[PDB]
Each structure stands twice: as C-alpha cells, then as structure tokens.
Amino acid sequence: PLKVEKFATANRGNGLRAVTPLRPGELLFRSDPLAYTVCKGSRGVVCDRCLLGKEKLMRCSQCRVAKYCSAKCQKKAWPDHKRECKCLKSCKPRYPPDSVRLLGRVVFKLMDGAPSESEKLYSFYDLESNINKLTEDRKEGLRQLVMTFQHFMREEIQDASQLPPAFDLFEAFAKVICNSFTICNAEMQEVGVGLYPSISLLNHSCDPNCSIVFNGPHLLLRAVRDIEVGEELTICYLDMLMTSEERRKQLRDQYCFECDCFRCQTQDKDADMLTGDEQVWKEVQESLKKIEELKAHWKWEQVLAMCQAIISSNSERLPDINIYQLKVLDCAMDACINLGLLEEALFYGTRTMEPYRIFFPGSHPVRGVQVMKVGKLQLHQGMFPQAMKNLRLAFDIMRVTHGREHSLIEDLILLLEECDANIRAS
Ligand SMILES: O=C(Nc1ccccc1)OC[C@H](CN1CCCCC1)OC(=O)Nc1ccccc1
Ligand SMILES: C[S@@+](CC[C@H](N)C(=O)[O-])C[C@H]1O[C@@H](n2cnc3c(N)ncnc32)[C@H](O)[C@@H]1O
Ligand SMILES: [Zn+2]
Numbered sequence: 001p002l003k004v005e006k007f008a009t010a011n012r013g014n015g016l017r018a019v020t021p022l023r024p025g026e027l028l029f030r031s032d033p034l035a036y037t038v039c040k041g042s043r044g045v046v047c048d049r050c051l052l053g054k055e056k057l058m059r060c061s062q063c064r065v066a067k068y069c070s071a072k073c074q075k076k077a078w079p080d081h082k083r084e085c086k087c088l089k090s091c092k093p094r095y096p097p098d099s100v101r102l103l104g105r106v107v108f109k110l111m112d113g114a115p116s117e118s119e120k121l122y123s124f125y126d127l128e129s130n131i132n133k134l135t136e137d138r139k140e141g142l143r144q145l146v147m148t149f150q151h152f153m154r155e156e157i158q159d160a161s162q163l164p165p166a167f168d169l170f171e172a173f174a175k176v177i178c179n180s181f182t183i184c185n186a187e188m189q190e191v192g193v194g195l196y197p198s199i200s201l202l203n204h205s206c207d208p209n210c211s212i213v214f215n216g217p218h219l220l221l222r223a224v225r226d227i228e229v230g231e232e233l234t235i236c237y238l239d240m241l242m243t244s245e246e247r248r249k250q251l252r253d254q255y256c257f258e259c260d261c262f263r264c265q266t267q268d269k270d271a272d273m274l275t276g277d278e279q280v281w282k283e284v285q286e287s288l289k290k291i292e293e294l295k296a297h298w299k300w301e302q303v304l305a306m307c308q309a310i311i312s313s314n315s316e317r318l319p320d321i322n323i324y325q326l327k328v329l330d331c332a333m334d335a336c337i338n339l340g341l342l343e344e345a346l347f348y349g350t351r352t353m354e355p356y357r358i359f360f361p362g363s364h365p366v367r368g369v370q371v372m373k374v375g376k377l378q379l380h381q382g383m384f385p386q387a388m389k390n391l392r393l394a395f396d397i398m399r400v401t402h403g404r405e406h407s408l409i410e411d412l413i414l415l416l417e418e419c420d421a422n423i424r425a426s
C-alpha cells in the first residue's frame with residue numbers, strides 16, 4: 001500500500017499527493033534509477049556502478065572508459081554496459097555529453113530490460129517534455145544532442161526498429177532536460193546523473209515538504225514536514241544558496257516555469273544572501289565558476305589554493321552569510337578534508353554553521369551532512385563535548401532526511417556511540 005499517489009494538478013501538470021497523513025522522516029518511496037551514469041568530472045574517480053571512489057579503479061578492457069571499484073561491480077554492471085561499450089569503444093577519443101550517455105542507457109534499458117520498478121508510478125513515456133514552451137535557442141541545442149546521440153550510438157542503433165515504438169529522440173532529450181536528477185555521494189559531492197521517472201512526479205517548491213537523498217544510485221524520498229491527506233508533495237529542485245533571481249533563471253531555462261511560491265514573491269532571504277561589498281562578491285561569484293569546475297574534477301589542491309586567496313585575501317573580504325563567500329568556505333572545507341588538513345577544515349566548516357542554519361531551514365540533508373562533517377572534525381581533534389553536540393544535531397536532522405534505510409545513519413550512530421563513550425569515560 002503506497003503512501004503517495006499520482007494526481008492531475010490544477011496548473012502544474014501531474015503531481016504526487018499524500019494518501020495518508022505523513023510525519024517528518026517518513027519514508028515515502030525508494031527507487032533505483034531507470035538509467036544512470038557517472039558525471040563528466042567524476043569519470044575515472046568513482047566507480048561507474050556504485051558511485052564510490054576507490055583509490056585505484058579497474059577499467060573495462062574493451063572500451064577503457066567504464067571504471068569500477070571491484071570485480072563485483074564490473075561484472076554486475078556488464079548487462080547495462082554491454083551495448084554502450086561498443087559505442088564508447090568505436091568513438092574512442094570522443095566522449096559524449098553526460099545526457100547522451102544517459103539516454104543511451106535509457107534506450108537499452110527500455111529495449112532489453114524487464115519493466116523497471118523505477119517506472120511504477122510514472123514512466124519515461126509519461127515524462128513532461130515542455131516541448132511547447134522551449135525557446136528556439138533550446139530547440140537548436142536539442143537538435144545538436146539528437147545528432148550527437150545518432151553519432152555515438154551508430155554501432156548499436158541504426159534505425160527506428162532499435163528504439164521503442166514511436167520513440168522520438170528530440171522529445172526524449174527534452175524530457176531528459178527537465179527530469180534529470182543529480183546523484184550526490186554521501187559527502188554531498190555530485191557524482192552522477194540519473195532518471196527516476198516515478199520521482200519525477202514531484203513538483204518543485206522553494207520551501208518543500210519532502211526531500212530526496214542518494215545512497216549510491218539508490219534514491220530515498222522522505223517527508224520533512226507534517227503532510228495532510230491530499231496535500232501535494234514537493235521537493236526543491238535547486239541548490240538552497242541561490243537568490244530568487246537566480247532561481248527564476250534556472251527554473252525558466254531548465255524547467256520552463258515561473259515560480260509563484262511565497263519566497264519568490266517576496267525575495268525571501270535575498271538581501272542577507274548578498275550582503276557585503278557588491279564588487280567583491282561579483283568577483284567571488286566569477287571565481288566560483290573555476291573553483292566549482294575544479295571541485296567537480298576532484299582537484300582539491302587547486303580548489304584550496306583558489307579559496308584561500310579569497311578567504312584570506314589581502315583585499316576586502318565578505319561576510320560568511322554572503323552566499324558566494326559561503327560557497328567558497330564550503331569548497332575550502334571539503335578540499336581540506338580530502339587533503340587531510342583537518343584543523344583548517346574545521347575552521348572553515350565551523351564558520352559555515354550559522355549561515356547553514358539560516359539558509360537550510362527545518363530538516364535538509366545538505367545541512368545534516370555539513371553538521372556531521374563538523375562534528376566528525378571536532379571528534380578527531382578531541383573536542384568531545386562540542387563534537388557530541390554537533391553529532392547529535394546531525395542525527396536530529398538526518399533521522400528525518402536520511403533515515404534508517406540510508407547507510408550514513410549507521411556511520412553516524414558509530415560516531416555517536418564513540419563520542420559518547422568518551423564523555424562517559426570521565
Ligand atoms: O567520512 C566519510 N563520509 C562522510 C563524513 C561526514 C559526513 C558525510 C559523509 O567517509 C570517509 C571518507 C574517506 N575519505 C578520506 C579523504 C580522502 C577520500 C576518502 O571521508 C572522510 O573521512 N571524511 C571526513 C573525515 C574527517 C572529518 C569529516 C569528514
Ligand atoms: C520533474 S517534472 C514534475 C512533474 C510534472 N508536473 C509532470 O506533469 O510530469 C518538472 C516539470 O513540472 C512542472 N513544474 C514543477 N514544479 C512546478 C511549479 N512549482 N510550478 C509550475 N510548474 C511546475 C514544470 O513543467 C517542470 O518542467
Ligand atoms: Zn563499485
């Protein structure tokens with residue numbers, strides 16, 4: 001018996017609503033992807049199957065593009081990699097955009113695979129394409145993706161008989177644009193992209209009542225507020241550290257809608273997000289383009305050097321609640337963690353704590369993980385009472401956002417048991 005059901009909304013297409021009253025932390029749906037792939041920057045850094053980094057990955061001998069953490073993942077990935085391997089090999093120096101590799105896997109799954117549990121509530125066939133709202137600029141880009149797909153896939157797909165019935169590649173890429181999910185690892189680093197068609201029933205809110213979290217490629221959907229029978233379920237499609245004008249642009253460009261929520265009507269939090277000298281934060285926003293590019297490719301030493309030049313600039317500095325300053329602090333913390341610079345990581349991480357409390361209200365998995373990183377940093381440096389407070393705070397958030405079905409709770413319970421034994425050892 002499901003706790004959620006598809007319905008037709010008044011003005012935003014299909015959606016999902018509660019069948020029964022829901023409480024914070026309640027598991028609503030869980031799903032493997034219909035199709036997924038590793039992202040550009042993480043290719044060769046994380047396992048194509050389980051999306052975990054190992055220090056040394058094994059490559060597929062035939063294409064030498066797919067890489068794996070273990071014989072177990074390489075062998076289990078083979079049915080879903082079989083046909084793309086052909087194409088990646090044939091096009092050896094060329095690597096396709098992520099969306100093209102993704103759609104390749106969609107087609108092979110729908111052609112060769114049994115009906116997917118991911119499509120239980122709503123199928124790839126059903127997905128919104130927004131084709132009557134696409135701008136001419138967007139259509140041109142989709143036509144290029146179609147031609148890229150035809151080129152990449154030519155070893156395996158030559159005619160329409162190798163696509164699902166009446167499959168239209170232009171429409172399929174239109175669906176991919178507004179229905180792709182960014183898969184994050186346990187540390188909330190972007191590592192993959194996937195389609196989860198039942199989860200695509202959820203409409204957007206800038207102040208949502210549900211949240212998704214990833215455990216490898218597996219997706220958990222949880223309530224993060226009380227929800228009444230019949231109430232629409234929403235998730236936030238967007239990074240929380242964005243102004244209403246930034247959200248407007250992305251929701252128009254990627255999802256073809258105008259957001260009517262209270263936060264957009266009132267520019268909620270915009271003023272605080274943009275405090276400090278605007279010439280300084282325009283420069284930092286510009287620099288973040290390279291910093292985030294370096295981060296997506298796991299280039300931690302280069303990330304840290306660019307962030308230090310901002311955080312400890314000789315020139316004017318920004319308040320930590322400024323969102324571009326805050327993003328730099330977060331990138332610097334993660335770089336220090338992965339570089340083993342744990343004292344410097346704690347300094348940057350502690351500074352993000354109050355801004356994260358403000359900008360991630362209620363129960364948000366990004367804040368839960370950030371607090372857990374800070375508590376873990378405090379535990380490794382012997383600050384047991386403060387670590388214990390932050391690890392317990394992380395648990396209060398992540399019991400709602402992650403839940404017992406997510407492996408990171410088990411890891412957090414271990415830090416709580418450990419840190420607690422130390423306080424009681426006095
Ligand atoms: O601890 C976690 N994850 C994790 C941690 C917190 C929240 C959410 C997730 O996994 C192990 C992974 C191993 N990592 C070591 C660096 C090189 C790459 C592999 O990173 C870490 O030790 N982190 C870490 C260490 C100290 C303080 C805070 C975080
Ligand atoms: C992931 S799908 C959500 C389900 C979609 N309504 C459907 O019928 O399949 C994303 C699309 O839903 C619509 N949508 C999502 N949130 C919306 C919102 N808050 N207001 C208006 N339309 C929204 C837009 O068409 C968007 O491109
Ligand atoms: Zn693996």
Ligand SMILES: [Zn+2]
Pocket residue numbers: 060061062063064065066081085086
């Ligand atoms: Zn291969």
Ligand SMILES: [Zn+2]
Pocket residue numbers: 205206259260261262263264
């Ligand atoms: Zn909004």
